[PDB]
């Protein structure tokens, strides 16, 4: 069908597997379904206060290899068990990082990292990976950049995050008010806290947004509202993790009529884009936690099997278990890190 | 179909008329299609620096009544023909205003302003309105809050705008890189200029984003980049229209390899939310324009048949031709203001 | 998507405008909707036994030109009004004739009679034609060859027929049990009556059949049973119209527990494929009717503006208002034949 | 969406999993794909006249239990391997038997035999069954009652049949002209042979028919013609298997330009609805074959693990391996009847 003045800047547009196809091929096993249900209920209590543990969303910056991802998941699953009594460990399974610039479009948009853009392969690979991880008993945390992807993966998400650059977007807020899991809004790029707070209030109400039915047709979604949303401090022009800021944030939250709780992102802006510094932020935060700090309900750490990152866009033989986006701490620091956190929660415990 | 851990916060979700249904029922008449082709070409020239005229996106804050909206159009169309050598008048046909708070969800989401949420009626009403306006010879400018609505109306848009709360959203940038019309990114809420500049650069590159085919099915869209994007100064905590700022902005664009050009929004934050102050901003801006400021390729004015706004909640029978969202200057000030700008453009010519 | 051992004999398969698109573009006008509502009730009243009037499905064998079709309609409409007291005239608007062999695939499958197979144009042309006809006051009768087409046109059909070659088809029976209009089953090709009788029974029950939603998705339809079905005698190896056969048929019907009512097809096998002989059948039948025969509720006549038939694959240009499938009596004989029936109906009455 | 005069006799209509969902969940394993490809090639050589082996479509009348069907399959696969130089054994996997009104609607329409009508469960169950059967090495033969089901299972069918009640239906002829597997048309109910002969010719040509894309959307299909179609003699008011009839048929075929070859159904009308008599028909037929009849390229036998049949309406636990539709010869007679047929084929060979 040819319409006038239509699709002028569209190189190409093609049907995507309908959600139902992905659900039918990779249905949630009984374990996977449990892992999800339980991890959601658990995060709900921590946010409701009825639990003194720390939510810990730790994992690779972005996932580009299911093999490494599942090995990583295996290790993280062990620690999840060990520190089970203090922490509620959840894997950060993110498939793409929003780039103002160019770069790899992620596991879903371009599974083969060769600009082939086999997105239907992406969905398959992505969903199977989440399915496997959840099946093994390890909950997963993911990000939601648009209003359509949720239909293919939300049911395997125990926790999700609306990034900094979209926290103020009405549509993303409306989306969050309909997600079946706890949502965490990041503070503005420059460090602005108001946006995230308003977001939290908006997510709590009922909304309408366009997306697609599980059969893939365009649809209007009417949400109920989501009360399990909290803020995520990822720094601005200067870190947000200091007790000085926590104090500030705790203020604004109550001022807005929302529980004074926050999650702290050791990476990104709080890490000054230096994966090494995540260990330092851990120091300051662990102290706050142990020194009787309750408002902090969770943290976020970018870690992989191998520290640092590597250039994919330079035509280099990628190394296994090493992030190809933001730099992540190695598995050594990750363990030490988690152990410290576990204790700071024990200290604080009283 | 019942899935585990699914749609826990979804009150309801229903099929939405596929785009093809709207296109088939309301196809572009030959006039409408010309109107759209021509006005897009015109704005392209102004943005390429080959037309000393001014792009003027003027019209109701939000449209809630096709009748008034069509009367308004008839009037604006007259001036459009009159001042056509100084200005390139384009009607602001917006259907909804993003709200944190509560409020009417707009003509599309709730055509009957009674929370009946007859969105399929919305699309028919909206698309038929744009169709009529364009058919009369008056181009229309709209805003795009999501990645799906475009499919139902973009072909009747001669110009579009990515609002302040979304200018930094990667998806909305990607979406802009695929629209068939010039796009205008607003500066951040607090006044931040960088976010709109980065946006402009990104929208010029080819991107991938999910949406739906004209047949209504979940699809992946590959754009080809949009070079007809510009910034829109709508003020921050303090107005942006002063030659002081304009000078800063022009510097930012040039430093980012972009043409020093800007559109100035007389309303919203530049008007301090006082519809009457739009007349004042007009003074200062007509000043710079007459003075020979060529970085100002266009302005935006919220105006209706009758000035001021009114409420829906009040229970009093809505007043004809009067905004139910942001306050707008009446038709009298409008005719006045347009004639000033007309002269200002002449001034900058001699 | 590439599947093994799949589509080996498919030259090509393409999406079809979803029904909703055709409904949105060509909604039934008031006059059209009523014309259908009244014609159905009226035919129902007849099958009920409370109307001595005769249902007369008369019209071109197949329609290939909207212009001649609407002229024909205009004329038939006049008579429809004139003989309103004795006959319930309904136009036969058939788009295709099932051919073992080759030949034109009909107005819908190939609107342009040039093998271009523009089916989406067919749907639009066909639907608009029925819409105009109805809007003028003339009900329409059509045939249903598959389970999908109904979704695009049934709402404009006041009466439908399941042809001889499909009367014994389970799917077509299930389909008829869900049509919103009276359905008429024809007796088998060789003259068999049992098949049509079983069909009338089966169609009276609720069934399940696959088709598509108004949105174009594959769906499961659950009908509620259709009690307005009757048999159509179209002859076998030798005509069926004689009182001898009528008598046997009425008996078979009662024997099967169904009302003893029949519709007689003057054309096809009862006419021995001799369009002229339709006038003779009219004589024998008008006789039974005038003689008190009440089981005859209706008749079917193939007639056009110009009698006879012409060949499409003959390459030769086409003569206006002349069938390109089965030969039809001209408009002169039509007006004559209709009036005869009118009188025969008066006879049976007064 | 509510339309005028629409869906008046529709109790309900719901989306059906799109084909792509079944294909994604149950993709053909390599073996299954081979089994299917090879058996189609084999049956092709037979019909082409380049193989003296006999095609044997034997199996339950209908399948209501995957577990027994798989046991049957295992037994039959063994004989398939043994008698492979004489017979090309293909399992009859039919899910439903057309009934005038009352009765179980089949494994697909009602998997749970409790009127729950879990058709999506049907497709999953049916497709998985065919998938496992083919994967084990046993080809499968099925029937196609509508134009939509093929999309979900045809890729697992090595041979298919158009039943007696639909052989004369144009849409089913068109559909056969597009199937990727050899098709068998059954003679009319009353024994008529012409209808199946015409069908074979029709299915040989290219046609158009509506159905749905693999994505589930209403679509128009353009076939390329099917040359691997043959007749199936299943008796009329009296059996068709006698050499007398086989002689008439062979003439009818040659008279129509078709190779004189037939498949003889030992069951149904040829068996006078007496499962025991299938053994008798086998006698007369093995006779003809052994006596040098090269026109008999195949036979069809209704057989299960246990002879006879049983009712659902009875209310007693169902017997394992026992038809709930037409009566079938049990397993012992099957091994018998096959071994006979094998020798006959061996006979005719020398
Ligand atoms: N299925 C999502 C909700 C959703 C519905 C529709 C569109 C987008 C998201 C969930 O369970 O979280
Ligand atoms: N059709 C739109 C572009 C578009 C396609 C697909 C999704 C979103 C937008 C235009 O002409 O601008
Ligand atoms: N819409 C048809 C019925 C129908 C529904 C679905 C499939 C086929 C037919 C009618 O009103 O008569
Ligand atoms: N896919 C089927 C053919 C088919 C396509 C579309 C509709 C119906 C049938 C086959 O391989 O035989
Ligand atoms: Mn990162
Ligand atoms: Mn406004
Ligand atoms: Mn005819
Ligand atoms: Mn049977």
Q: Report DSSP letters for D138-150, one per residue.
A: --EEEE--SSSTH
Q: Which among B132, B253, B144, B138 is positioned nearest to B204, based on CA atoms?
A: B253
Could you give the C-alpha distances from B164 to A191, B173, B190, B228, D42, in angstroms and in order? 17, 12, 9, 18, 67
- Helix or strand or coil: residue A1? coil
Could you give the C-alpha distances from C225 to B93, C181, C204, D2, in angstroms and in order? 49, 11, 5, 21
Distance CA D285, CA D291 (A): 10
Distance CA C89, CA C298 (A): 10
Is any ligand 1 atom within 6 A of the Cβ of residue A171? Answer: no
- Min distance C259 CA to chain A CA atoms (Å): 45
The shortest CB-CB distance from D12 to any of C11, C12, C222 is to C222
- For residue A214, the chain D residue with the least C-alpha distance is D17
Distance CA D207, CA A335 (A): 67
Distance CA B125, CA B110 (A): 11
Neighbours of B170 (CB within 10 A): 21
Neighbours of D274 (CB within 10 A): 10
Could C6 and D178 be called an inter-chain contact, meaning their C-beta atoms sit closer than 8 Å?
Answer: no
Best mutation site among A1, A4, A9 for testing chain B: the one with the most B CBs within 10 Å?
Answer: A9
How much distance in Å is there from the Cα of A159 to the middle of ligand 4? 42
Which of the other chains make 3 or more beta carbon contacts under 8 angstroms with chain D?
A, B, C
CB B166 within 8 A of CB B202: no
| Pocket-testing residue among B178, B207, B219, B228, ligand 2, by greatest number of atoms within 8 A of Cβ | B178
- Atom of ligand 2 at shortest range from CA of A6: 11
Mark out the alpha helices in chain D (DSSP H runs): 19-25, 30-48, 66-82, 106-109, 119-136, 150-153, 170-176, 194-202, 243-255, 278-290, 331-349
Residue D108: how many CA atoms within 13 Å on its side-chain side?
Answer: 28
Distance CA B261, CA B228 (A): 11
Kindly give the pairing relationship between strand A208-212 and strand A218-223. Answer: antiparallel
Distance CA B246, CA B241 (A): 7
- Helix or strand or coil: residue C5? coil
CB B13 within 8 A of CB A213: yes
Chain B neighbors of A202, CB-CB under 8 A = 100
- Atom of ligand 4 at shortest range from CA of D157: 12
CB A242 within 8 A of CB A284: yes
Q: What is the dihedral of CA C63, C69, C73, C76, to 10 degrees?
A: -70
Mark out the alpha helices in C61-193 (DSSP H runs): 66-82, 106-109, 119-135, 150-153, 170-176
* A317 exposure class (CB count in 10 Å sphere: 0-12, 13-18, 19+): exposed
Angle at C216 between CA C210 and CA C218, to 5 degrees: 30
Q: What is the dihedral of CA A24, A30, A31, A36, to 10 degrees?
A: 70
| Pocket-testing residue among D10, D11, D13, D16, ligand 3, by greatest number of atoms within 8 A of Cβ | D10
- Helix or strand or coil: residue A91? strand
Distance CA B299, CA B54 (A): 8
- For residue B120, the chain D residue with the least C-alpha distance is D1
Neighbours of D172 (CB within 10 A): 29
Distance CA A161, CA A150 (A): 12
Distance CA D143, CA D300 (A): 13
Query: DSSP class of residue A167?
Result: T
Q: CATH assignment of B2-350?
A: 3.20.20.70
Nearest-10 crossing angle of helices B278-291, B243-255: 60
Distance CA D335, CA A228 (A): 66
Distance CA A209, CA A147 (A): 8
Q: Residues 110..149 of B with a Cβ closer than 8 Å to D: which?
A: 120
Which of the other chains make 3 or more beta carbon contacts under 8 angstroms with chain A?
B, C, D
Chain breaks of chain A after residues with C–N above 2.5 Å: none
Distance CA D146, CA C219 (A): 13
Q: Which ligand is nearest to the CA of B150?
A: 2
Distance CA B229, CA A75 (A): 48
Q: What is the DSSP string of D18-72?
A: -HHHHHHHSPPPHHHHHHHHHHHHHHHHHHHT----EEEEEE-SS---HHHHHHH
Neighbours of B292 (CB within 10 A): 10
Is any ligand 1 atom within 6 A of the Cβ of residue A150? Answer: yes
- Helix or strand or coil: residue A290? helix
Could C222 and D1 be called an inter-chain contact, meaning their C-beta atoms sit closer than 8 Å?
Answer: no
CB A154 within 8 A of CB A148: no
Residues 6+ apart with CB under 8 A from B49: B259, B261
Best mutation site among D1, D16, D118 for testing chain B: the one with the most B CBs within 10 Å?
Answer: D1
How much distance in Å is there from the Cα of C62 to the middle of ligand 7? 7
Residues 6+ apart with CB under 8 A from A100: B170, B173, B198, B201, B202
For chain D, how many helices (H) and strands (E)? 11, 11
Distance CA C102, CA C79 (A): 36
Helix, strand, coil share (%) of chain D residues, nearest 5: 40, 20, 40
Distance CA A303, CA A94 (A): 12
Is any ligand 2 atom within 6 A of the Cβ of residue B174? Answer: no
Residues 6+ apart with CB under 8 A from B319: B306, B310
Q: What is the CA radius of gyration of chain C?
A: 20
- Min distance D327 CA to chain C CA atoms (Å): 21
- Which residue(s) pair with A160 in the sheet? A142, A183
- Min distance D20 CA to chain A CA atoms (Å): 6
- Which residue(s) pair with C231 in the sheet? C185, C262
Q: Which among B33, B111, B54 is positioned nearest to B293, based on CA atoms?
A: B54
What element of type H or E holds D14?
strand D10-15
Q: Which among B25, B195, B185, B165 is positioned nearest to B99, based on CA atoms?
A: B165
Distance CA B294, CA A96 (A): 41
Write down how long chain A is: 350
- Min distance C46 CA to chain D CA atoms (Å): 19
Per-residue HEC secondary structure of chain B comes to: CCCCCCCCCEEEEEECCCHHHHHHHCCCCHHHHHHHHHHHHHHHHHHHCCCCCEEEEEECCCCCCHHHHHHHHHHHHHHHHHCCCCEEEEEECCCCCCCCCCCCCHHHHCCCCCCCCCHHHHHHHHHHHHHHHHHHCCCEEEECCCCCHHHHHHHHCCEEEECCCCCCCHHHHHHHCCCCCCEEEECCCCCCCHHHHHHHHHCCCCCEEEEECCCCEEEEEEECCCCCEEEEECCCCCCCCCHHHHHHHHHHHHHCCCCCCEEEECCHHHCCCCHHHHHHHHHHHHHHHHHCCCCEEEEEEEECCEEEECCCCCCCCCCCCEECCCCCECHHHHHHHHHHHHHHHHHCCC
Residues 6+ apart with CB under 8 A from A297: A46, A47, A54, A55, A230, A261, A262, A263
Chain breaks of chain C after residues with C–N above 2.5 Å: none
Neighbours of D49 (CB within 10 A): 11
Query: CA C241 from chain center: how many Å?
Result: 18
Chain D neighbors of C27, CB-CB under 8 A = 3-4
Residue spans of the domains in chain B: they are 2-350
Per DSSP, which regions of chain A are E strands?
10-15, 54-59, 87-92, 140-143, 159-162, 183-186, 208-212, 218-223, 229-233, 262-265, 296-302, 306-309, 322-323
Residue C15 has phi, psi (to 5 degrees) of -50, 145
Is any ligand 1 atom within 6 A of the Cβ of residue A192? Answer: no
Distance CA C235, CA C241 (A): 7
CB A220 within 8 A of CB B11: no
Q: Which among C251, C189, C202, C145 is positioned nearest to D190, based on CA atoms?
A: C189
Distance CA C17, CA C14 (A): 10
Chain B neighbors of C25, CB-CB under 8 A = 21, 24-25
Q: Which among A2, B215, A166, A74 is positioned nearest to C215, based on CA atoms?
A: B215
Residues 6+ apart with CB under 8 A from C81: none
Does D1 contact B at CB distance below 8 Å?
yes
Could B211 and A119 be called an inter-chain contact, meaning their C-beta atoms sit closer than 8 Å?
Answer: no
Could D215 and B217 be called an inter-chain contact, meaning their C-beta atoms sit closer than 8 Å?
Answer: yes
Under 8 Å CB pairs connecting chains B and D tally to 6
Write down how long chain C is: 350
Distance CA D151, CA D166 (A): 19
* A244 exposure class (CB count in 10 Å sphere: 0-12, 13-18, 19+): exposed
Per DSSP, which regions of C179-276 are E strands?
183-186, 208-212, 218-223, 229-233, 262-265
- Min distance D19 CA to chain B CA atoms (Å): 15
Could D16 and C190 be called an inter-chain contact, meaning their C-beta atoms sit closer than 8 Å?
Answer: no
Neighbours of D85 (CB within 10 A): 11
Kindly give the pairing relationship between strand D218-223 and strand D208-212. Answer: antiparallel
Q: Which ligand is nearest to the CA of A273?
A: 5
Distance CA A235, CA A109 (A): 28
Resolution in A: 2.8
Q: Whose CA is nearest to atom 7 of ligand 2?
A: B211
The shortest CB-CB distance from C215 to any of A1, A120, A217 is to A217
CB D266 within 8 A of CB D222: no
End-to-end CA distance of chain D: 69
Could you give the C-alpha distances from B301 to A209, B276, C310, in angstroms and in order? 28, 11, 66
């Amino acid at each position: 069908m040819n319409y006038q003045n239509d699709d002028l800047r569209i190189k190409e547009i093609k049907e995507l597997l309908p959600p139902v196809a992905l659900l039918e091929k990779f249905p949630a096993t009984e374990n996977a379904a449990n892992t999800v249900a339980h991890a959601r209920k658990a995060i709900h209590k921590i946010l409701k206060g009825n639990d003194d543990r720390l939510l810990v969303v730790i994992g690779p910056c972005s996932i580009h290899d299911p093999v490494a991802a599942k090995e990583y998941a295996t290790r993280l699953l062990a620690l999840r068990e060990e520190l089970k009594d203090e922490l509620e460990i959840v894997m950060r399974v993110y498939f793409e990082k929003p780039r103002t610039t160019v770069g790899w479009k992620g596991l879903i948009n371009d599974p083969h990292m060769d600009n082939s853009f086999q997105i239907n392969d992406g969905l398959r690979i992505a969903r199977k990976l989440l399915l496997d991880i959840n099946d093994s008993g390890l909950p997963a945390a993911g990000e939601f950049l648009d209003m359509i992807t949720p239909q293919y993966l939300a049911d395997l998400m125990s926790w999700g995050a609306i990034g900094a650059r979209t926290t103020e977007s009405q549509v993303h807020r409306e989306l969050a008010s309909g997600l079946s899991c706890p949502v965490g809004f990041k503070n503005g790029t420059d460090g602005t806290i108001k946006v995230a707070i308003d977001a939290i209030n908006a997510a709590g109400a009922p909304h309408c947004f366009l997306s697609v039915t599980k059969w893939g047709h365009s649809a209007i979604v009417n949400t109920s509202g989501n009360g399990d949303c909290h803020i995520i401090l990822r720094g601005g022009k200067e870190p947000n993790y200091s007790a000085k800021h926590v104090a500030e944030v705790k203020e604004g939250l109550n001022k807005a009529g929302l529980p004074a709780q926050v999650m702290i992102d050791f990476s990104h802006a709080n890490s000054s884009k230096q994966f090494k510094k995540q260990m330092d932020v851990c120091a300051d935060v662990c102290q706050q936690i142990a020194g009787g700090e309750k408002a902090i309900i969770g943290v976020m750490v970018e870690s992989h099997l191998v520290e640092g990152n590597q250039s994919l866009e330079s035509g280099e033989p990628l190394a296994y278990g090493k992030s190809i986006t933001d730099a992540c701490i190695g598995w050594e620091d990750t363990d030490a890190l988690l152990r410290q956190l576990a204790n700071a929660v024990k200290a604080r415990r009283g």
